[PDB]
Design a protein around this ligand. Structure first.
Ligand SMILES: Nc1ncnc2c1ncn2[C@@H]1O[C@H](COP(=O)(O)CP(=O)(O)OP(=O)(O)O)[C@@H](O)[C@H]1O
Ligand SMILES: COc1ccc(C(=O)CSc2nc3c(=O)[nH]c(N)nc3[nH]2)cc1
Ligand SMILES: [Cl-]
Ligand SMILES: [Cl-]
Ligand SMILES: [Mg+2]
Ligand SMILES: [Mg+2]
Length: 157
């Protein structure tokens, strides 16, 4: 078993309802158990700014699934909650795999640690709440990133 950390985001169709339904669905993923859920945060949008504020959260999930098997299930949850294919536009549910233990994976389908996560306060702050001692695959400590980079603290939802 490995602990995966998943970021949740929603800014359409009642984000609180979306994130709750997504948590229940994550709890139904085979060979997996939720370990920890962060607080829910109201965050201003990165990317296009002409869209509603996001609800963001992070979850620690212990799993025996292969990384791409976990991805299949997170994408299925996104599809069932109405995610459909502008760039970086509003969405009902986004589930990103931030980390899958200390694995590094570089494929088109799956890139872990998530592309750009070290520059996203809406991912790092909820992650720090649930895993303050977290160390990245390259040896960087989550605490040092937040200590050294200018990331505004988030407001709770
Ligand atoms: N760590 C990861 N978590 C989730 N999806 C990933 C991923 N690495 C790669 N992907 C791929 O990313 C594809 C689509 O991602 P999207 O959710 O549409 C982009 P986004 O979240 O709006 O921007 P971002 O990827 O810059 O956060 C999926 O088909 C999936 O295969
Ligand atoms: C370089 O600048 C960036 C461009 C795009 C992004 C994205 O994450 C992809 S779309 C998106 N998702 C969310 C989100 O979940 N929460 C918040 N607050 N904003 C979001 N925007 C990040 C940084
Ligand atoms: Cl959507
Ligand atoms: Cl890393
Ligand atoms: Mg995303
Ligand atoms: Mg995504």
């Amino acid at each position: 078993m490995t602990v995966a950390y998943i970021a949740i985001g929603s800014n359409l169709a009642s984000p609180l309802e979306q994130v709750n339904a997504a948590l229940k669905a994550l709890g139904d993923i085979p060979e997996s158990h939720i370990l920890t859920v962060s607080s829910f945060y109201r965050t201003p949008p990165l990317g296009p700014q002409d869209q509603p504020d996001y609800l963001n959260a992070a979850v620690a999930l212990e799993t025996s699934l292969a990384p791409e098997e976990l991805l299949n299930h997170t994408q299925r949850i996104e599809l069932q909650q109405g995610r459909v294919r502008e760039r970086w536009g509003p969405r009902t549910l986004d589930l990103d795999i931030m980390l899958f233990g200390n694995e590094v994976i570089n494929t088109e389908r799956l890139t872990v640690p998530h592309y750009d996560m070290k520059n996203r306060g809406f991912m790092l702050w909820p992650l720090f709440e649930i895993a303050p001692e977290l160390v990245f695959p390259d040896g960087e400590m989550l605490r040092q990133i937040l200590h050294t980079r200018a990331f505004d603290k988030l407001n709770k939802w």
